[PDB]
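Fill in residues.
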């Protein structure tokens, strides 16, 4: 299945790291589900991206 996806790219306007607590900046967002976060959430992420 298409697991998580990571493409280093800046967003369009503004976002928010659901893992941390404040906005999201040019980091890593999954372009298949629409996930977004910094390096604190590359491995700390528990359930990988397997939504549907
Ligand atoms: Zn994802
Ligand atoms: Zn984060």
């Amino acid at each position: 299945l298409t697991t998580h996806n990571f493409a280093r790219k800046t967003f369009l306007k503004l976002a928010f790291c659901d893992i941390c607590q404040k906005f999201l900046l040019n980091g890593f967002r999954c372009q298949t589900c629409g996930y977004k976060f910094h390096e604190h959430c590359s491995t700390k992420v528990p359930t990988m991206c397997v939504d549907w």
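The two ends are 10 Å apart (CA to CA).
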